[PDB]
């Protein structure tokens, strides 16, 4: 599998987009971890290149 974006290269922010959170992005890594931020995460946060896309 190839590399996701850094944290602040992917825009990830503080509290949630909507709907949208850390756990609500498309893959959020569970119980406490991601992929594109460096773990453990805040589920609060959000980013704008979340894990699970191309
Ligand atoms: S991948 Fe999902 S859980 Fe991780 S920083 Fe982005 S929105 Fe958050």
Known sequence: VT???????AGYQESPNG?????????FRPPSSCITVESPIS?????RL????A
């Open 43 to 47: 589920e609060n946060g959000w980013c």
């Open 19 to 27: 709907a949208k959170r850390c756990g609500t992005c498309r893959q």
């Open 3 to 9: 590399k996701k974006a850094s944290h602040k290269d």
């Open 50 to 53: 979340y894990a699970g896309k």
